[PDB]
Amino acid sequence: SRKKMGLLVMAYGTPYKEEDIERYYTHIRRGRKPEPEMLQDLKDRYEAIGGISPLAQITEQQAHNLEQHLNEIQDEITFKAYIGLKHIEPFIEDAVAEMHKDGITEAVSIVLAPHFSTFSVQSYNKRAKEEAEKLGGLTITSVESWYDEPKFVTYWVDRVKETYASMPEDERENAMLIVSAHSLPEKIKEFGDPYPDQLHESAKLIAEGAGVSEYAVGWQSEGNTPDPWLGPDVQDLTRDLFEQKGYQAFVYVPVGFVADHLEVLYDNDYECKVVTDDIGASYYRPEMPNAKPEFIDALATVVLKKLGR
């Protein structure tokens, strides 16, 4: 009696093993293979964060739990999850072609990145729809953003509350909250890309809900191109804020990311920790959503709301 629908879960993607590093970054670098020294460094970074194997598993677990949960909280639709990635197989097109072959005719998509941007989200959705249009007989409704879903805000608000609560007294009174997301080229502004504003809005909503009056907005993990990228970078912001007010502790909320991957386990947990360790301040970074029940419910609500349920 249920209506069959495809659940297209898209994401950036991650290597499955150390030997994937080369091709994964070549793709990210738009066809330019990393030099020998860079390849070695990347391997060292992944080893330092506990290994690669767990990365892709988080995404698979996210897609799977979301599929099971949605199927349990409503009784009108039966969802079937398909993972589509940008930088490694299964690619976005591959997932769409599979849904078609399996007989899916109606699907709903969601990107594992809360803020809309013309660079990624719009591109992912555009590519999924074009593949479906090319195959025919299949339509897709795409979630464009969900950073403002109350349940998602609540997740971070609660994590931040716990973090400040566990803080000593003299730290709680001189702590700074830094909310960040993946940095992108500044040129996106020429299209009126709401990306920057959505990050600032997430920061305001999380700070307000947690009761934190002192916070800043930062970017991280910027790529390497001649054109300028959104700033300031979390590393510089941390130092700059310290040099002007001398905070004793920094709380990092990489709201732009949803899992324990390299741009949090290393770009925050290591690179940011280096700076805080250097200035003599305490480092804090709340648990990422990953595949936890609270997060999966938030995502389920996002999907159902998109479908008018």
Q: Can residue 144 be called a binding residue for Cl ion (CB under 5 A)? A: yes
**Is 24 or 116 the residue whose CB approaches Cl ion more closely?**
116
Q: Determine, following the binding rule CB under 5 A, whether residue 284 of this chain makes contact with Cl ion.
A: no
Size of the site for Cl ion (CB under 5 A): 4
The answer to the question of residue 148 lying near Cl ion (CB under 5 A) is no
122 binding Cl ion? (CB under 5 A): no
Q: Among residues 145 and 174, whose Cβ is nearest to Cl ion? A: 145
By the rule CB under 5 A, 143 interacts with Cl ion: yes
Q: By CB under 5 A, tell whether 111 contacts Cl ion.
A: no
27 is in an annotated binding site: no
Asked whether residue 19 is marked as a ligand-binding residue, the answer is: yes
DSSP states of the chain: -PEEEEEEEEE----SSGGGHHHHHHHHTTT-PPPHHHHHHHHHHHHHTT-SHHHHHHHHHHHHHHHHHHHHH-SSEEEEEEEEESSSSSBHHHHHHHHHHHT--EEEEEESSSS--TTTHHHHHHHHHHHHHHH-S-EEEE----TT-HHHHHHHHHHHHHHHHTS-HHHHTTEEEEEEEE--BGGGGGGT--HHHHHHHHHHHHHHHHT---EEEEEE-----SS-BSS-BHHHHHHHHHHHH--SEEEEE-TT--SSSHHHHTTTTTHHHHHHHHHT-EEE-PPP-TT-HHHHHHHHHHHHHHTT-
**Which of 68, 78, 141, 145 touches Cl ion (CB under 5 A)?**
145
CB nearer Cl ion, residue 93 or residue 144? 144
Whole-number minimum distance, CB 262 to Cl ion, in Å?
A: 26
Interface with Cl ion, residue 42, by CB under 5 A: no
The least distance separating Cl ion from the CB of residue 30, rounded to whole angstroms, comes to 26
Q: Shortest Cβ contact with Cl ion: which residue?
A: 145
Is 93 a residue that touches Cl ion (CB under 5 A)? no
Indicate the residue among 108 and 138 with the shorter CB distance to Cl ion. 108
Q: CB-wise, 146 or 229, nearer to Cl ion?
A: 146
124 lines the binding site for Cl ion (CB under 5 A): no
Binding site for Cl ion (CB under 5 A): 116, 143-145
